[PDB]
Amino acid sequence: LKQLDSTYQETNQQVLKNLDEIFNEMGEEDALNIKKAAIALRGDLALLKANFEANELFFISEDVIFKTYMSSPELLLTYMKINPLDQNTAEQQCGISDKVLVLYCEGKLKIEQEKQNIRERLETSLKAYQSNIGGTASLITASQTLVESLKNKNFIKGIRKLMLAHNKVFLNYLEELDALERSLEQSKRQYLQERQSSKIIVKLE
Amino acid sequence: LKQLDSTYQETNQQVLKNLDEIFNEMGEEDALNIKKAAIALRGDLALLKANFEANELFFISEDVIFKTYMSSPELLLTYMKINPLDQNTAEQQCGISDKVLVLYCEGKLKIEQEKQNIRERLETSLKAYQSNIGGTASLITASQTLVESLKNKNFIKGIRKLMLAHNKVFLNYLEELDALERSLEQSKRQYLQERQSSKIIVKLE
Numbered sequence: 001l002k003q004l005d006s007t008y009q010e011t012n013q014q015v016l017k018n019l020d021e022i023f024n025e026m027g028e029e030d031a032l033n034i035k036k037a038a039i040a041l042r043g044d045l046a047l048l049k050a051n052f053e054a055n056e057l058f059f060i061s062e063d064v065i066f067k068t069y070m071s072s073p074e075l076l077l078t079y080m081k082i083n084p085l086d087q088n089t090a091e092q093q094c095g096i097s098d099k100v101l102v103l104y105c106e107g108k109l110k111i112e113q114e115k116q117n118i119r120e121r122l123e124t125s126l127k128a129y130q131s132n133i134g135g136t137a138s139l140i141t142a143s144q145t146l147v148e149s150l151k152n153k154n155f156i157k158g159i160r161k162l163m164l165a166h167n168k169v170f171l172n173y174l175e176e177l178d179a180l181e182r183s184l185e186q187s188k189r190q191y192l193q194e195r196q197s198s199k200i201i202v203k204l205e
Numbered sequence: 206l207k208q209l210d211s212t213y214q215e216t217n218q219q220v221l222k223n224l225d226e227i228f229n230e231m232g233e234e235d236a237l238n239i240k241k242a243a244i245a246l247r248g249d250l251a252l253l254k255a256n257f258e259a260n261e262l263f264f265i266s267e268d269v270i271f272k273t274y275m276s277s278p279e280l281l282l283t284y285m286k287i288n289p290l291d292q293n294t295a296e297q298q299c300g301i302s303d304k305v306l307v308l309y310c311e312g313k314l315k316i317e318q319e320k321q322n323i324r325e326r327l328e329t330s331l332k333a334y335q336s337n338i339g340g341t342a343s344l345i346t347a348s349q350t351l352v353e354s355l356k357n358k359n360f361i362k363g364i365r366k367l368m369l370a371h372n373k374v375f376l377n378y379l380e381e382l383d384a385l386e387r388s389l390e391q392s393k394r395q396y397l398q399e400r401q402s403s404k405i406i407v408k409l410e
Contacts, residue, residue, distance in 0.1 A: 001370060015360055055374075056371075072388070076385070098400075101397075104389065108390075152346055156345055159216065161212075162210065163334050167331070170327040173271065176271055180275055187279075187309075
């Protein structure tokens with residue numbers, strides 16, 4: 001049982017952690033729909049958690065009963081001697097001359113009372129579970145699909161964006177060489193100007 | 206760029222990490238299909254990684270060129286003075302009386318050579334990318350869907366299994382009280398036997 005809890009509680013935290021990842025008329029109703037589902041799933045999980053915690057509290061106190069005065073007939077009858085029933089029920093159901101048989105009768109009633117207390121708690125636990133489980137499951141499935149979808153988009157985006165950056169670097173080298181080449185043709189043009197000037201000047205004595 | 210890498214490389218590791226989660230004729234071809242897709246995605250990612258690494262190596266060495274002898278016409282012409290072209294090309298394309306114009310001609314050729322070297326590398330990078338990206342994307346989507354699906358099944362299983370364990374605990378208390386009650390009726394039956402014996406014996410003097 002102790003293990004089953006830690007598994008349940010990691011599931012619980014992690015699903016909630018997933019939900020924390022958050023912040024035309026078709027997409028309006030969707031954008032709402034997502035966050036309505038998130039608060040709906042927080043509620044669901046809160047109710048299921050409280051219900052598991054209620055049972056586990058009951059189990060601790062109940063286990064002690066089955067170790068002590070519900071552990072054997074002898075201990076039951078000793079316990080009933082010390083803790084008799086309301087004279088109300090003892091008159092009506094256990095009105096017997098034999099005091100020992102009264103003790104047996106009271107023991108039987110106490111067992112029936114405890115059976116009932118356990119039945120009631122189980123039925124309560126089943127209803128809490130049953131009224132949240134189908135919606136909870138759907139909502140977990142929905143949000144995992146969202147987690148998946150976003151991660152997936154980000155993995156692929158991470159590959160594209162680097163590739164586009166690499167292409168920009170390559171194309172930039174080409175831009176730079178074009179600039180360098182036009183700048184060199186211009187330097188050539190000025191050299192040719194300077195040397196045709198120098199030719200003319202030197203010729204003149 | 207440095208950032209874009211770390212994002213890409215987390216994507217890379219995490220997708221591979223996902224794949225590490227691993228180990229009627231309809232389900233035969235599926236069970237194979239999953240692991241064939243996994244090795245197919247390892248290959249894809251290995252090729253894309255090598256291609257990004259090849260470019261980033263080239264960028265380091267290339268950036269130095271554009272800082273040094275491709276940074277200006279003056280430095281180019283100084284560099285060409287020190288490192289002239291093969292006399293092969295210099296004869297055929299730069300056969301000029303003016304040694305300075307030969308230097309300009311050679312500079313222009315060197316720029317054209319570098320443009321070509323960059324074009325070739327870009328086209329190589331585009332082909333490596335283009336021949337793996339569509340399959341890689343599909344396969345990432347497929348495996349995320351598997352990651353999602355398994356997690357989802359385990360979250361919900363984690364809730365059911367605890368609930369079933371709680372129901373077993375409740376029902377066990379009921380089993381125990383039934384046992385206790387039959388055991389008490391039996392203790393009563395023996396008391397009644399012992400006391401009817403005691404009644405008979407005491408009466409006899």
